[PDB]
């Protein structure tokens, strides 16, 4: 086996709370939705409806955190457009002004202290930044 620790099973949980905006426990299409045209998309009512029903196992309309949880672990066009949402300025980096706009506005409030840790772990040849292969691998797996 590869694993799935205690530490990823509390920082989902956190990827969770974010788009369950309102407690509940569920993620309802509206909560989709509203992340989404929060970051640069615009979905429609059924795009959002065929996206909760491919990951949401019980099929009860939403999805609770064991769905949420088994979806996020164990491809990319889309990760090229998610590389573009972070870096603003289109220049072939995201630094840790962007990676955390990006949260803030997307109601994430990390001191200045997450933002470097966060860069600072996905950031392999060692500059402070982050570049579309440092983003690719991170996220390949
Ligand atoms: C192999 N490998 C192991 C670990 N990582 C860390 C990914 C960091 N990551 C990040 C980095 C730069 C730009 C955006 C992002 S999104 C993000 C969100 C949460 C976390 C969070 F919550 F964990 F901090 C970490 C990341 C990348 C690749
Ligand atoms: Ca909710
Ligand atoms: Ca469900
Ligand atoms: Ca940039
Ligand atoms: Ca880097």
């Given amino acids: ?15 969770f709370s974010l788009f ?3 407690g509940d426990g569920t993620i309802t299409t509206k909560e989709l939705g509203t992340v989404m045209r929060s970051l640069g998309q615009n979905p429609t009512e059924a795009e959002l409806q065929d996206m909760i029903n491919e990951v949401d196992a019980d099929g009860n309309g939403t999805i609770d ?5 088994t979806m996020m672990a164990r491809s990319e ?6 590389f573009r949402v972070f870096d603003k300025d289109g220049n072939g980096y995201i630094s840790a002004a962007e990676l955390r706009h990006v949260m803030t506005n997307l109601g994430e409030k990390l001191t200045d202290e997450e933002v470097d840790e966060m860069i600072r772990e996905a950031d392999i040849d060692g500059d402070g930044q982050v570049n579309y292969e440092e983003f690719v691998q991170m996220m390949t797996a």
């Fill in 20 to 22: 369950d905006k309102d």
């Fill in 65 to 69: 955190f064991p769905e949420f949880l």
């Fill in 77 to 82: 066009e889309e990760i090229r457009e998610a």
């Fill in 1 to 15: 086996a590869d694993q799935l620790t205690e530490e990823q099973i509390a920082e989902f949980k956190e990827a």
